[PDB]
Amino acid sequence: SGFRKMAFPSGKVEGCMVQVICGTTTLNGLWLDDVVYCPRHVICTSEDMFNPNYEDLLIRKSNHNFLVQAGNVQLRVIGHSMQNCVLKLKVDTANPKTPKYKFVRIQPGQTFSVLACYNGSPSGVYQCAMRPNFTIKGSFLNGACGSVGFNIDYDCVSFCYMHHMVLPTGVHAGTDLEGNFYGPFVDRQTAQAAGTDTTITVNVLAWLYAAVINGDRWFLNRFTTTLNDFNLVAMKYNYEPLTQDHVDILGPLSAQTGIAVLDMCASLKELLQNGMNGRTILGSALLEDEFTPFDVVRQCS
Amino acid sequence: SGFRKMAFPSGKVEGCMVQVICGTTTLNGLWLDDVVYCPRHVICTSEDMFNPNYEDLLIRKSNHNFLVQAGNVQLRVIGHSMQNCVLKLKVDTANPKTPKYKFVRIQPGQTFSVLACYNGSPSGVYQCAMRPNFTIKGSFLNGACGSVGFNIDYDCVSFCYMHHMVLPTGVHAGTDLEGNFYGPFVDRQTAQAAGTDTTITVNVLAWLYAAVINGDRWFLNRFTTTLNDFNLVAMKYNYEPLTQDHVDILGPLSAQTGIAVLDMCASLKELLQNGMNGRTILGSALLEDEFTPFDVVRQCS
């Protein structure tokens, strides 16, 4: 029984957490095979972070300027490169604890597990979600730059995020393990707009479905609704417009519970038009949008 | 920046997750050195779970009736014992991945990280909290019996919980790694009362303190209060009576924020007498009591 925010085991990712020092900056790195992946802003000082020409700054930096330490060992950077916004430090020793990995880019809404690290050593793990505005509301301090977000599919750890910076809005932004940023964010110290963060409707419905599996049924209503007029209500409350493909995603949840997905959209309509009036759907007085339907199926088995 | 439910890295605990089969029951086990710790109800069938004399049932079970598999290997049970409510299966091979561990019993209110496992393989990790009624609101299914709850202090993994059963109330109950249950629960299939679960006040104040560190300051008030009359309000809302020792626990949080702990108790008084009127303290319309002040300090550093 039960249902809560759960993250993947971080054991296969802890073995790839190294500390990359480039002078005064200390951040984390991803050691897969003989390549160490770290944010490329490790070559920027502090005043360089405002207007950084990474091509020119990388020219000044040599191979011996990157210090990679895996616990208490030392890897020799025998080649420095810069793929988009990430640095691929080619090292000598290949990581013997390299799990079966793949570099994948997630879609806005999907969830992943972040292993926060400081000075290369992991500190904690929590399940985040790529918000529609491509931001991430997580827990990152001054040394959390370089921490990765991963989903573990079977025995293959799929890395999909790397923390890069903390926006002045309070949230965080990063990139995939290839180098391309998530959203309209650049690795500079300028004021960047995050945008209006909308609510993931397909994830909220999956969260409401798990509530019926666990015992929370008060939000269930006798009314039904259409897929279009629900959006007309959802678009006013800044909710993502539910698609027919998303209805197919909630197929097994609609089957195991016996409640049609369109009947769930009518219950959510009353949850927004009339509010919750204070209750505890699984333990929250608000509606959770950081639970993908796969997370509900894999947990409420 | 940021603050959320964070758990310890499960890497050092994944290497001790074995599957203990005793006939028809499949549950998880803790393999530290050459002893495998599992719930003792693995020797009970299904109808035996209602009125089990574990002393007599353990007599019928021999050493070769316990099948321990660590991934795909096999350990020989060369000695079966029963310490209180846990089984200590002495095996041949010693676990080479045994971290520096210690068996500690936590106090009502302290938090820990649970690594949920099924068929011996870990499934996920989440940060729970030993509720005042010695229950735990977690995510445990039919095969989650045997999962452990651990805190990682420096390089020493302190095991403090082992899931045993799912109460008919919906919550869960377990024991420490020695065998003694948490609360008035026994490893039988009878109706057992969990009791009125009160709110951990010392943990709520630490959660309110982290909100000031992150930017949530609307609950802060100009009033102060006394330590006694706050309890008179807290005891009516089923909140744990705040002690002077707990005031000392919130010392560093009162220092870094500049807000006295008694002034925080006056803000909580209005949060209960007048309610929240719908807001987002760190992202919740309710008050969180599963955040110990140590978790706030170690995260909001």
Author numbering:
A (entry chain A), B (entry chain A): 1 to 301
Quoted passage from the original study:
Initial attempts to crystallize SARS-CoV-2 Mpro with the single E166V mutation were not successful possibly due to compromised protein solubility. We reasoned that suppressor mutations, such as T21I and L50F, which have been shown to rescue the severe fitness defect of the virus carrying the Mpro E166V mutation, may also mitigate biochemical defects. Of the several proteins screened, Mpro with four amino acid substitutions, namely, T21I, L50F, S144A, and E166V (hereafter referred to as QM for quadruple mutant), yielded high-quality crystals, allowing for structure determination by itself and in complex with nirmatrelvir, ensitrelvir, and bofutrelvir at resolutions ranging from 1.71 to 2.33 Å. The structures of Mpro QM, E166V/T21I/L50F, and E166V/L50F all show a symmetric homo-dimeric assembly very similar to that of the wild-type enzyme. The electron density map shows that the substituted Val166 in the active site takes the rare gauche+ side chain rotamer (χ1 angle = +60°). This is likely because the more common trans (χ1 angle = 180°) and gauche– (χ1 angle = –60°) conformations would position one of the two Cγ atoms ~2.6 Å from the His172 side chain and cause a severe steric clash. As expected for the substitution of a non-polar valine residue for glutamic acid, the E166V mutation abolishes the intramolecular and intermolecular hydrogen bonds with the side chains of His172 and Ser1, respectively, which stabilize the S1 pocket of the Mpro active site. Ser1 maintains its proximity to the active site within Mpro dimers through alternative interactions. In particular, E166V, E166I, and QM showed ~25-fold reduced kcat compared to wild type, and E166L showed even poorer activity with ~65-fold lower kcat than wild type. The triple mutant E166V/T21I/L50F showed the lowest Tm among all variants tested (Tm = 48.2°C, ΔTm = –4.8°C).
